[PDB]
A paper describes a structure:
Our work utilizes biotin–[name] (Sav) technology to develop artificial metalloproteins (ArMs) that mimic the active sites of natural copper metalloenzymes. This approach leverages the strong binding affinity between biotinylated metal complexes and the Sav host to confine synthetic metal cofactors within a protein scaffold.
We were able to successfully prepare and characterize the [name] variant or [CuII-biot-et-dpa⊂2XM-[name]-K121Y-Sav], where the molecular structure determined by X-ray diffraction reveals that F112 can maintain support of the N49 coordination to the Cu cofactor. However, after several attempts, in crystallo reactivity studies of 4 with H2O2 were inconclusive due to heterogeneity and disorder within the crystals. It is possible that the increased disorder of the F112 structures upon H2O2 exposure is caused by the lack of a stabilizing H-bond, exhibited by Y112 in 1, with the backbone carbonyl of A121. Nevertheless, both the intact protein mass spectrum and enzymatic digest analysis reveal peaks corresponding to specific oxidation of 4 upon peroxide-treatment. Additionally, the rotameric change and coordination of N49 in 1 and 4 also suggested its potential role in reactivity. When the location is appropriate, such as in the case of S112Y and [name], steric constraints shift Cu center towards N49, allowing amide coordination and then S112Y and [name] are readily oxidized upon exposure to H2O2.
Residue numbers in the entry:
A (entry chain A), B (entry chain A), C (entry chain A), D (entry chain A): 12 to 134
The structure:
Amino acid sequence: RDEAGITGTWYNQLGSTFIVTAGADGALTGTYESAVGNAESRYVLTGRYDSAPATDGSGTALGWTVAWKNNYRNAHSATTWSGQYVGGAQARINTQWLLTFGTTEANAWASTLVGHDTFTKVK
Amino acid sequence: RDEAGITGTWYNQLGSTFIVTAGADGALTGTYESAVGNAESRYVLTGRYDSAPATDGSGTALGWTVAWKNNYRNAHSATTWSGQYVGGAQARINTQWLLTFGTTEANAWASTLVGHDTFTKVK
Amino acid sequence: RDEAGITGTWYNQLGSTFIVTAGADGALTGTYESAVGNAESRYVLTGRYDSAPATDGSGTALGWTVAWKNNYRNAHSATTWSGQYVGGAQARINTQWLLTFGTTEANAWASTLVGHDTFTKVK
Amino acid sequence: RDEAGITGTWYNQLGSTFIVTAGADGALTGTYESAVGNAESRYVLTGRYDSAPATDGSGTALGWTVAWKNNYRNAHSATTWSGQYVGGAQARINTQWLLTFGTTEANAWASTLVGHDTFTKVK
Ligand SMILES: O=C(CCCC[C@@H]1SC[C@@H]2NC(=O)N[C@@H]21)NCCN(Cc1ccccn1)Cc1ccccn1
Ligand SMILES: O=C(CCCC[C@@H]1SC[C@@H]2NC(=O)N[C@@H]21)NCCN(Cc1ccccn1)Cc1ccccn1
Ligand SMILES: O=C(CCCC[C@@H]1SC[C@@H]2NC(=O)N[C@@H]21)NCCN(Cc1ccccn1)Cc1ccccn1
Ligand SMILES: O=C(CCCC[C@@H]1SC[C@@H]2NC(=O)N[C@@H]21)NCCN(Cc1ccccn1)Cc1ccccn1
Ligand SMILES: [Cu+2]
Ligand SMILES: [Cu+2]
Ligand SMILES: [Cu+2]
Ligand SMILES: [Cu+2]
């Protein structure tokens, strides 16, 4: 079971901080703080993970969303990360993400950025 | 405010059904049922949306996650949709999505599918 | 063989025009004209397709690149489309695309947009 | 001008080898050899890059396509990489990619993988 492996504080290669609790039922809840972009302080996150992953050495699939509104700022956008948790001495959450921002219909072709973040327990 | 616009039952071009409640605080909660892939019946979803979007004609950014485990099936995978809600007579949620499935490290380069779903209130 | 099916003029849902010749060796060459974004008139495109696709009803994989520089404009960016050609009475090229624009290293997390275009022989 | 910077042999984090010539007109031509997946030996690649990039420290946008057919194997698929070249002592091509494989229409929702490769001149 990866409940204990996922729960806690994670850091990605940009210096962002991802604080998460994995519930026994597959829930992810916590906060996200981005070191880049139109963001400051913490934002609510929610997501889901596979709470009964394979036992063949495969990673644990998961995903979560942040909408970039909090009491300080509203960037009219949301990011979803989709990835897998890989436990062990150098545990990692390897993700790809989609950031959609609100646009008019004329500009909707240009409304989604894509990228990739790797999270570790150190740094 | 788009709380009332988002909450309810949505359908995409594959025949999938997305049932969601938008909370006043930006929460998305509900269930998802996929007409394709390794899925049957309903799965828990959670996500976030911008609860104070622009008023200039821009869409409302949002995102949500489904992990594909329920009491019937476990497909060791999770999908996140990232998109914007566009209200009106033919309201729509236009999304792009990432489906990550658990893999070994050797196969992780091939662990994420990408696609796009458009949800409407009819069909 | 889909050489004859692919070669010709295609249109996507934005009003863009894709003019392509499929070579017997798997080459794609032609021009692209975008109805949106920092673009005007025609841009060089090059790409590749599967010149011996399956015969089981599967689509024909292909992809191509446009760099958005021509004699009129330079938008310091490039788009790649990746998709499959599906022949018949309503033939189609269904794609997803990545648009990367030049950025500094500080802004590289935000350098790639993702989207999807569907091309038809009419419109 | 990045013609000289791009032309040559590149390696990504999977052990794949990308051999490319950048033409003065913005053309990319060469061969690709993948260390993973349904691939063996070299495949034709073609693409485009920005031949007059900004001079403000921004990367050089580019993209290319490989269709995974050669004299040995046909994997009925094509990958496009979209990214930017960043010159200097540790030059790099940072990409994201889309791999589409031929599918029936019923399976087309699952026809595209997405990932990210980083290429260097060493390794
Ligand atoms: O920047 C954000 C929110 C923070 C994103 C951080 C990302 S999430 C993925 C990656 N991983 C991280 O840890 N951090 C980064 N949203 C942009 C929304 N704007 C578009 C946009 C796109 C690129 C750069 C700036 N803006 C639209 C807009 C609406 C109102 C005002 C201003 N702008
Ligand atoms: O199919 C699913 C879950 C349902 C996805 C429906 C998508 S979500 C986006 C799109 N929109 C929709 O409404 N529906 C579709 N997960 C695949 C996980 N497997 C890989 C995979 C990839 C493609 C096809 C089948 N499998 C790995 C695996 C682990 C154990 C057993 C079997 N397979
Ligand atoms: O707009 C373009 C080129 C045309 C893209 C058309 C796309 S391709 C996919 C889709 N399908 C189509 O048929 N058309 C659209 N490049 C943007 C580069 N800029 C970022 C950017 C992002 C969004 C909107 C405007 N700019 C950076 C920049 C460098 C210098 C000056 C100005 N800007
Ligand atoms: O594996 C390939 C070609 C090589 C891709 C290497 C990628 S490109 C991006 C990344 N970067 C690299 O340097 N290497 C990797 N195509 C898969 C096509 N098949 C689906 C598929 C998906 C995942 C794994 C295996 N197959 C469909 C199919 C058609 C007929 C027979 C068998 N299979
Ligand atoms: Cu912004
Ligand atoms: Cu599966
Ligand atoms: Cu621009
Ligand atoms: Cu394969």
